[PDB]
Amino acid sequence: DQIKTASGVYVCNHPLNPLDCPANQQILLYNRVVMPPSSLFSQSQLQGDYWQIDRNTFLPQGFHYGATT
RNA sequence: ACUGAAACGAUUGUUGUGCCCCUGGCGGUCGCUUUCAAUGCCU
């Protein structure tokens, strides 16, 4: 009742791991946190599919472990 | 292998050493064991 599904350009505003990013997502802008074993994004603008899970955050859809490999 | 696996800010150490509750101090001052009494009664 409070999530919805959409597609377009979105500011993620949660952290997000670039290694887990699939095709049908692309990263347009990112700000990064340099960290072992691999750096995260702390903020990113993406193009692709998402879930607006409350009226002020947008979560990337379709992420899975190591999807860039 | 959770940027992972194990992971003692630890060991030793006296709040110590010296110190007089001390000095001065009249239980003092006043006070009648007092008041009355037949060695007596007779030979």
The pair of structure tokens assigned to A42 is 């702390």
Contacts of A52 (CB under 8 A, 6+ apart): A3, A4, A6, A58
CA distance A13 to A25: 16
Partnered with residue A55 across adjacent β-strands are none
Q: How was this structure determined?
A: cryo-EM
Task: Please state, as a whole number, how many other Cβ atoms lie within 10 Å of the Cβ of residue A41.
Answer: 20
Length A56 CA → B39 C1' (Å): 144
Residue with tokens 């999530």: A3
Contacts of A11 (CB under 8 A, 6+ apart): A43, A44, A45, A58
Length A16 CA → B41 C1' (Å): 153
Q: What is the resolution of this structure in A?
A: 2.9
* Residue A60: closest CA among A35, A17, A33, A1: A17
Partnered with residue A48 across adjacent β-strands are A8, A25
Task: Please state, as a whole number, how many other Cβ atoms lie within 10 Å of the Cβ of residue A48.
Answer: 19
Instruction: Please count the helices (runs of H) and the strands (runs of E) in chain A.
Output: 0, 4
